[PDB]
Amino acid sequence: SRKLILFIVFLALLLDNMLLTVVVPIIPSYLYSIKHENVQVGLLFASKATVQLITNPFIGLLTNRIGYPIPIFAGFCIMFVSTIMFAFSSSYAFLLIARSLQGIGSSCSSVAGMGMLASVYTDDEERGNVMGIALGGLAMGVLVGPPFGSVLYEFVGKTAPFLVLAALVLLDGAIQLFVLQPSRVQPESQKGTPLTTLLKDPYILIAAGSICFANMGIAMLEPALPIWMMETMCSRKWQLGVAFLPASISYLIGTNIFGILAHKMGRWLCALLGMIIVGVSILCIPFAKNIYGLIAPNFGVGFAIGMVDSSMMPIMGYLVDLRHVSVYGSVYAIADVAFCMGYAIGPSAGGAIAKAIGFPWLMTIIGIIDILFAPLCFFLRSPP
Ligand SMILES: NCCc1c[nH]c2ccc(O)cc12
């Protein structure tokens, strides 16, 4: 009964993303009110991803020395403290500290859970099958975070969403203490193929680069689209929110379908087609004149990104099993880093380029870069 571990990682990802998307609208308003009663806000937004990026390799090295369960339970304890600090703290320094601890706990959870999933489901097809479901938790959390936070802030109070999240985190921790049972410290068997040797591999580099560019696309699209919308179409407030919902729905559908469908078609071909489709959709985005023109390209973007992730997350596993020692916590530490890249320099770099040249040229450059990198996935094909 290893489905409990899958449920644990699914819940961890879901709750992490729920907190991430719940905290996003509340912080700018009351922070500005307290200042009354650009650089710092960008620093606050990027601190979580920066700290996660910095602490990924250390978790990758520590899971080899002590194992997965102790790092996972620490992810529950840091995320519980971050959720209670977010609920009770109202100053800038305490906010920065909470967002940074959230980053540390999210690094622990992501790296250790992906390593444990890869080590428990050692079959090649089942690995992708379960990683698709686990990646679906991110989409579910992003989808259900904003409405949950909005209603709970609307009716009960400001601290109510955070207290409810804390109760759910406690339930998750109780389940973890029942099944995971992190009582003693157990070392792993063999060595870990140090990061310096793994970073010289061109195939791992190609997979990581594909993930990084595919995610940086949406990471720079998401905060730069409403600014263009309000100036071109003069859209209303709710239309700014409902326009990016097709991306979140299509990501869920595409992940859950292609986690199973990528093995039969070919992981390299699925990644190549995902790159081509996301590039074409980003290129067609600037031509839209009203919300209905934007519905379809967003669906294409989400579908393609789901394809790419659900094909390239299980391959990072297959490449170390094939060319290195079968220890996963340090290779997934690389993969997670790719994600953090998109979340670290995404919004800031996207803003400056858009002010300097314009938004259609930014989208054209993203699309051209994705289209040109797509042939590189041809080298990822299995030799037989
Ligand atoms: N790595 C998946 C990122 C992603 C895919 N679809 C999304 C929709 C909204 C969002 O904030 C993020 C995403």
From Swiss-Prot:
Changing residue 343 to F: Slightly reduces sensitivity to tetrabenazine and FFN206 uptake. Reduces serotonin uptake. Reduces sensitivity to reserpine. Largely reduces sensitivity to tetrabenazine and slightly reduces FFN206 uptake. Expressed in neuronal and neuroendocrine tissues. Detected in central and peripheral nervous system in particular in axonal and dendritic processes in dopaminergic cells of substantia nigra, histaminergic neuronal cell bodies of substantia nigra and tuberomammillary nucleus, in ganglion cells of sympathetic glia and in peripheral sympathetic nerve terminals in stomach and duodenum (at protein level). Highly expressed in chromaffin cells of the adrenal medulla and histamine-storing enterochromaffin-like cells of oxyntic mucosa (at protein level). This is Synaptic vesicular amine transporter. GO terms for cellular component: axon; centrosome; clathrin-sculpted monoamine transport vesicle membrane; dendrite; dopaminergic synapse; intracellular membrane-bounded organelle; membrane; plasma membrane. One of its GO terms (molecular function) is serotonin:sodium:chloride symporter activity. It is linked to Parkinsonism-dystonia 2, infantile-onset: An autosomal recessive disorder characterized by infantile onset of abnormal movements, including parkinsonism, dystonia, and poor fine motor skills, as well as autonomic dysfunction, including abnormal sweating, cold extremities, and poor sleep. Some patients have variable degrees of developmental delay. Changing residue 309 to A/N: Abolishes dopamine uptake. It comes from Homo sapiens. Strongly inhibited by reserpine and tetrabenazine. Also inhibited to a lesser extent by ketanserin and fenfluramine. Reserpine and ketanserin inhibit by blocking the substrate-binding pocket. Tetrabenazine traps SLC18A2/VMAT2 in an occluded conformation and its inhibition is specific to SLC18A2/VMAT2 but not SLC18A1/VMAT1. The lineage of its organism: Eukaryota, Metazoa, Chordata, Craniata, Vertebrata. Changing residue 222 to N: Abolishes dopamine uptake. Changing residue 142 to F: Abolishes binding to reserpine. Interacts with SLC6A3.
